[PDB]
Structure 1
Amino acid sequence: VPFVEDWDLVQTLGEVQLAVNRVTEEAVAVKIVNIKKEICINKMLNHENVVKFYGHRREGNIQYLFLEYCSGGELFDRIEPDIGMPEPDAQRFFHQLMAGVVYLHGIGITHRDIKPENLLLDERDNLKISDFGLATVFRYNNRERLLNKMCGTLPYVAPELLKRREFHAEPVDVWSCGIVLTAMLAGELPWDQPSDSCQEYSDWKEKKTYLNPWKKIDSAPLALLHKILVENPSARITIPDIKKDRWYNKPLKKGAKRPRVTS
C-alpha cells in the first residue's frame, strides 16, 4: 500500500513527538534522540499496563523509537495540588500500576524511576508505565543481581539507595509506588528525600500521621502506606502481600459509565 510508511509529526508531547500516519491516521509516539539498553529492554516488553514498543529506526546519528501513544497524558496532570484525586480513581490506578510492576519484576526488569510523570493514560484512562531509560535487568538466569547505582528522583527514592552501598531492586520500585499512592491521595509529596535530616521523614518514622500529607488520607489506604513506606527494605511489604491488603481489595470504584435507557 503506498505511503503507509509515512508519518507526520504534529505536536510535542515531551524529545517525544506525536506522529500521525499519512494513510491510516494511526497515532503513535516517536522518541527522537544508554539508548541501546532502552531499546533492548523495550523489545522484551509486552503488557497492557506497559507502553508498547513498536520498533526503532536509526538515520545517521539520530535514533527514532516508535512507541504507543497515550492520549490521556500523564498521571501527574490528574493529581490536583494539595487535594489528590477521588480515592476510587487512585485505587484503580494503583491496581494497574501493580499489574505493570508485577509484570516487569516477573521478567527481571526494574524501572527505577516510577513517578506520576512516567505513568501515562490511554484513551480509556488505562495506566501505562513509560520511560525505560533508567531501567535495568536485576534477575537473569534465575540469579538476582544487587544494584549499587544511584538512579531515580529524590522524592520517590527508597532510603536504602541513600544509606547502603548495595540493595535489592524490587523493594525500591515498591517504595516509589507508595510515594505515587501518597501523591494521588494527598496531592503532595511527603518529603524532599527519605533522610533523617528531613524533618518530614523523621515525623513519619515517629508515626505523626496527624500531620499532612497523612491527615488527608483515610485510615485503610494509610494502613497500606504504613506497610510500604518502611525504612528497612527487608521488612517492607512485597507486592504479593500488597495484593492481600484490605484497602487494595476494598470495593470502591464502579465500572465505566455504559449507555442506558429507562422504560
Structure 2
Amino acid sequence: VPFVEDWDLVQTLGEGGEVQLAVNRVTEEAVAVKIVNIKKEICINKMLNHENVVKFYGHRREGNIQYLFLEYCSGGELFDRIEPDIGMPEPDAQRFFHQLMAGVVYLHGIGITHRDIKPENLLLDERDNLKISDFGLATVFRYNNRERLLNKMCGTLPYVAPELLKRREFHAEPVDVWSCGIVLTAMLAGELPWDQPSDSCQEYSDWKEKKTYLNPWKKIDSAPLALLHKILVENPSARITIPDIKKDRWYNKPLKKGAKRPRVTS
C-alpha cells in the first residue's frame, strides 16, 4: 500500500526536544512522535508491553535527530483532571490509582523503575485509561534475579521519597510506591503536601507528627487517608509494598460504577 509510511505532524503535545501528534496520511491513525537518557529510553521502551504503559511502536534516526513513535493518549495528562485545591471525585481517583498500581506492578515485575511518577507523566487514552509515560529517567533495578541498589538523584522534589535525600543507597520499588502516594494525595486534595520530604519542611514535619486536621489531609476521607498513612512512611523498609496496597480496605472499597453504557426503557 503506497504512502502508508507517511505521517503528518499536526499539533505540539509537549516540550523538553519536543513531542508532536502525528496522523497517518492513508489510515488517519494518530501516534505521538518524540523528537530528541535516549539510548536507554529506546532500550527500556523495547521491553514494554502493558495496557497501563504508553506503547512503543519503534524508532528512526535521521542524522543527529532521533524519532520515537509512541502511543497517542487523546485524554491528555492526569494533571489536568485534578482541580486545584479540590482534586477529583474519590471513585475516579480510585479507578486511576488501580490502573497506576497495575502499570507499576508490571514495570517492577520486569525489573524496571520509572523514577519520575507524577500526574504530568500519567496520560489518559480516549476511554480515560491511565498510561505511564516517559522512560527517559527509568532504569533496570533487577537483572538475572539480582537486585541493584540505586544511588542516583532522579525525579521531581514534591514526589521523591525521603531516603533519596537522606541515604547514599536505596531500594528502587519503595521510591515508586512513595510517588504513587503523592499522586493519590494530589487526586484527592488538589494540592501537593510539601516542596520536598525533609525535616526542614514544616508541612513534612506536621505529617510525621500526624497533624491530619491540616491541609491537604483534612480534605481526604479516613479510608484513603489510612492508606496514605501506610504509603507516606519515612522508613522505606516499613513502607507498605504494592502486594499489601492491593489488600488495603479503601483500595478494595466499592465506589465506582462501570463506564456509562447506552440503555432504553419500556
SS at match of 2:123: strand
SS at match of 1:37: helix
Give the whole-Å Cα distance in 2 for the aligned partners of 1:148 and 1:34.
Answer: 16
1:20-50 deviation line (CA, Å, top 9, x unaligned)? 0000000000000120000000000000000
1:39-72 deviation line (CA, Å, top 9, x unaligned)? 0000000000000000000001000000000000
1:153-194 deviation line (CA, Å, top 9, x unaligned)? 000000000000000000000000000000000000000000
User: Which structure 1 segments of 5+ residues have no match?
Assistant: none
1:195 maps onto 2:218 in alignment: no
TM-score, length basis structure 2: 0.99
Q: Which runs of 4+ in 1 moved over 6 A?
A: none
1:218-250 deviation line (CA, Å, top 9, x unaligned)? 000000000000000000000000000000000
- Which residue is 1:57 aligned to? 60
1:108-128 deviation line (CA, Å, top 9, x unaligned)? 000000000000000000000
Give the whole-Å Cα distance in 1 for the aligned partners of 2:52 and 2:187.
Answer: 18
SS at match of 2:58: strand
1:74-99 deviation line (CA, Å, top 9, x unaligned)? 00000000000000000000000000
1:158 maps onto 2:176 in alignment: no
Alignment size in residue pairs: 263
Compare 11-20 and 143-152 and name the one that shifted more.
Answer: 11-20
Give the whole-Å Cα distance in 2 for the aligned partners of 1:239 and 1:32.
Answer: 34
1:3 maps onto 2:18 in alignment: no
Give the whole-Å Cα distance in 2 for the aligned partners of 1:33 and 1:128.
Answer: 21
1:123-134 to 2 correspondences below 5 Å: 123-134=126-137
Query: Which of residues 235, 241, 245 in structure 1 aligns to 2:244?
Result: 241
Compare 3-12 and 14-23 and name the one that shifted more.
Answer: 14-23
- Which residue is 2:96 aligned to? 93
Give the whole-Å Cα distance in 1 for the aligned partners of 2:222 and 2:205.
Answer: 20
TM-score, length basis structure 1: 1.00
Root-mean-square deviation (Å): 0.6
Give the whole-Å Cα distance in 2 for the aligned partners of 1:194 and 1:35.
Answer: 29
Residue 138 (structure 1) shift = 0.1
Compare 239-248 and 6-15 and name the one that shifted more.
Answer: 6-15
SS at match of 2:149: coil
Give the whole-Å Cα distance in 1 for the aligned partners of 2:57 and 2:245.
Answer: 32
Give the whole-Å Cα distance in 1 for the aligned partners of 2:3 and 2:212.
Answer: 60
1:22 maps onto 2:18 in alignment: no
Give the whole-Å Cα distance in 2 for the aligned partners of 1:16 and 1:82.
Answer: 29
SS at match of 2:84: coil
SS at match of 2:218: helix
Give the whole-Å Cα distance in 1 for the aligned partners of 2:241 and 2:220.
Answer: 21
1:2-24 deviation line (CA, Å, top 9, x unaligned)? 00000000000091100000000
Give the whole-Å Cα distance in 2 for the aligned partners of 1:15 and 1:34.
Answer: 15
Give the whole-Å Cα distance in 2 for the aligned partners of 1:202 and 1:195.
Answer: 8
